[PDB]
Amino acid sequence: METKDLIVIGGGINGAGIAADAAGRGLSVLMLEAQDLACATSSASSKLIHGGLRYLEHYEFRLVSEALAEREVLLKMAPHIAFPMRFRLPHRPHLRPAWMIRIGLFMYDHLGKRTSLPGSTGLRFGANSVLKPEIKRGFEYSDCWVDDARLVLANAQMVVRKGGEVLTRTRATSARRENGLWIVEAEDIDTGKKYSWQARGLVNATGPWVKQFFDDGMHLPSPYGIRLIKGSHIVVPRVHTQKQAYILQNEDKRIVFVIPWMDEFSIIGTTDVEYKGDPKAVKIEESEINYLLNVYNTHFKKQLSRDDIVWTYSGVRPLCDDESDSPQAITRDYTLDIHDENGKAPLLSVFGGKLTTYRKLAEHALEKLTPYYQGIGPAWTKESVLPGGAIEGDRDDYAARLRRRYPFLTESLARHYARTYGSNSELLLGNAGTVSDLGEDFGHEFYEAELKYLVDHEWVRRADDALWRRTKQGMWLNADQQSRVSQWLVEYTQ
Ligand SMILES: Cc1cc2nc3c(=O)[nH]c(=O)nc-3n(C[C@H](O)[C@H](O)[C@H](O)COP(=O)(O)OP(=O)(O)OC[C@H]3O[C@@H](n4cnc5c(N)ncnc54)[C@H](O)[C@@H]3O)c2cc1C
Ligand SMILES: CCCCCCCCO[C@@H]1O[C@H](CO)[C@@H](O)[C@H](O)[C@H]1O
Ligand SMILES: CCCCCCCCO[C@@H]1O[C@H](CO)[C@@H](O)[C@H](O)[C@H]1O
Ligand SMILES: CCCCCCCCO[C@@H]1O[C@H](CO)[C@@H](O)[C@H](O)[C@H]1O
Ligand SMILES: CCCCCCCCO[C@@H]1O[C@H](CO)[C@@H](O)[C@H](O)[C@H]1O
Numbered sequence: 001m002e003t004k005d006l007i008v009i010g011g012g013i014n015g016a017g018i019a020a021d022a023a024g025r026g027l028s029v030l031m032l033e034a035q036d037l038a039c040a041t042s043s044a045s046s047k048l049i050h051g052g053l054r055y056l057e058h059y060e061f062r063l064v065s066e067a068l069a070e071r072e073v074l075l076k077m078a079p080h081i082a083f084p085m086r087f088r089l090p091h092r093p094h095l096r097p098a099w100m101i102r103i104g105l106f107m108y109d110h111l112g113k114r115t116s117l118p119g120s121t122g123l124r125f126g127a128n129s130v131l132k133p134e135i136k137r138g139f140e141y142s143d144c145w146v147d148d149a150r151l152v153l154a155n156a157q158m159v160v161r162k163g164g165e166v167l168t169r170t171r172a173t174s175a176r177r178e179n180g181l182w183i184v185e186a187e188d189i190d191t192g193k194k195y196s197w198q199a200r201g202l203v204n205a206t207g208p209w210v211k212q213f214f215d216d217g218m219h220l221p222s223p224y225g226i227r228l229i230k231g232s233h234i235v236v237p238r239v240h241t242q243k244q245a246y247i248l249q250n251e252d253k254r255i256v257f258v259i260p261w262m263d264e265f266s267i268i269g270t271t272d273v274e275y276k277g278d279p280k281a282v283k284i285e286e287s288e289i290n291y292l293l294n295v296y297n298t299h300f301k302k303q304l305s306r307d308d309i310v311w312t313y314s315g316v317r318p319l320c321d322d323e324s325d326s327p328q329a330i331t332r333d334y335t336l337d338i339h340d341e342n343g344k345a346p347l348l349s350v351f352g353g354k355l356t357t358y359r360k361l362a363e364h365a366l367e368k369l370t371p372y373y374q375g376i377g378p379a380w381t382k383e384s385v386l387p388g389g390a391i392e393g394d395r396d397d398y399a400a401r402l403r404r405r406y407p408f409l410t411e412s413l414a415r416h417y418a419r420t421y422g423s424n425s426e427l428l429l430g431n432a433g434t435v436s437d438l439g440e441d442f443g444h445e446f447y448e449a450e451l452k453y454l455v456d457h458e459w460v461r462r463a464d465d466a467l468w469r470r471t472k473q474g475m476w477l478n479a480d481q482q483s484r485v486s487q488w489l490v491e492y493t494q
Helices: 013-023 053-058 061-077 098-110 148-161 207-218 286-297 358-372 396-405 411-420 422-429 448-457 463-469 479-492
Strands: 003-009 029-032 082-090 121-124 137-146 165-167 170-178 181-188 194-204 226-237 245-249 255-261 265-269 311-320 335-339 347-351
Touching: 003 013, 003 170, 003 181, 013 029, 013 148, 013 194, 013 347, 013 358, 029 148, 029 170, 053 061, 053 098, 061 082, 061 098, 061 137, 061 358, 098 137, 137 148, 148 165, 170 207, 194 207, 194 358, 207 226, 207 311, 207 347, 226 286, 255 286, 265 286, 335 358, 347 358, 396 411, 396 422, 411 422, 422 448, 448 463, 448 479, 463 479
Parallel strands: 003 029, 003 194, 029 165, 082 245, 194 347
Antiparallel strands: 082 137, 121 137, 170 181, 181 194, 226 265, 226 311, 245 255, 255 265, 335 347
């Protein structure tokens, strides 16, 4: 025994969130990830903890109000990686009447009741603004930004903290009920090593693959269809010097964001394109680029071309199929299904689920698995503080406090460590007292001490994990700098 209480198949936001919650209730948990943590949908989002302004249009109050209330919970759980942001909504009366926005903003302000985040206002835009001169009016309100891939990583760490196990580069190949228990089989994608475990409960949190795991892994009927709806984002040198995001109303009624990113760039996204095929192959396409630049170039005076684009990414939303014609009208609320046999071996499956709502998703999932467990602790995550999150304050004021005790750190490296690692920065820096104590410089102040730490404590196995998920250093390192990181990782992980 050898028998885990719970096995979670899935290492994106919904699987890590269920595993964490369960590990902190005393269940012995094993989370399996086929490749890396956040390697799919959860590292491809617009990176927003939002209530979901556009969803009020479709009367989605369960969701918008749940999500609104969650912004402030997440903002206390993970202040290294999440923070407040203001969004400016340019006014276009031919699409939505000023009187309507005004009603929407009120509901946004009061559906979740918020003890910290500011509140909405009107705006006039002059001849000197970033917007084309015909646009003269708007609105401003609040929502939050999170480092998505990192948030998944904070939940993986929380699982290990509470005695859970997290395997990556390990793909579950089947699950079958046998004599009251699950037999789960998995296979290490590199070495071909086989594994086999028994469990009392199973979570299918594989996201875009949820129904495929029923079909191919379990030979069971799925309770819901899934619609894959691709969205892509483009990244450009920052379009302006302001700190606010803009939310733009497009002619098709879908809103597109222009979000400041890393003090240096702007992300523009996203799109809604029905998708068929391997979710691992999703890539942005020509019309998506032309679409995103069009909505941007029709609103802002500084025009962008295709040539300005420095990076793009793309993922598929796994949305619970409510059968709507238009991909943009499909619900973003999640659905959980649970089912047992002879009152044993429950299977919880997750369909849909924003990053915003994951903790509450996870709490609902444990509500449903409780009957199967003892003995089982109560809910507890609303109170906690994710690993890295214990900064006795502000991130700009942990970055100062960090450089005060490690004053060999430049202000840019302190800012990075604080905004990435938070209170884990001391575990990374260990006993270093000079810059040369940090080891090989891999480029852009990404030192061997960081890389070693990522492997030892953040499940890094390949360069992309480190450079695109655990950090966004891949934005600055050249091709030969990146193969060196992979060379070192080969040397170290031997
Ligand atoms: C374009 C876009 C923009 C978005 N913007 C936002 C937004 O800003 N705010 C917000 O809150 N949400 C946003 N989202 C929604 C959000 O990203 C997703 O809802 C969410 O991340 C779903 O995560 P998941 O865990 O359910 O799936 P994912 O986990 O991210 O993917 C499933 C995981 O399961 C693994 N897996 C699959 N099969 C197996 C197996 N056999 N064995 C082991 N592992 C397996 C995969 O490797 C993968 O890691 C956006 C989504 C899209 C794509
Ligand atoms: C009873 C429910 C009232 C529905 C009114 C919804 C108006 C919300 O207002 C607007 O909605 C649009 C898309 O939803 C977007 O342009 C904006 O994000 C939002 O301000
Ligand atoms: C040549 C005459 C054109 C006048 C058309 C007036 C209607 C334009 O549209 C209006 O724009 C205003 C922004 O200032 C807002 O008061 C309203 O929300 C909107 O209805
Ligand atoms: C949040 C409470 C709801 C308030 C009712 C909305 C009234 C706004 O009404 C709108 O205001 C604009 C500027 O004053 C005008 O340009 C529009 O013509 C007008 O219809
Ligand atoms: C389909 C959208 C129409 C909704 C039915 C409500 C009628 C809209 O009527 C509007 O009411 C506003 C106050 O709320 C006024 O300020 C506007 O000038 C008026 O046109």
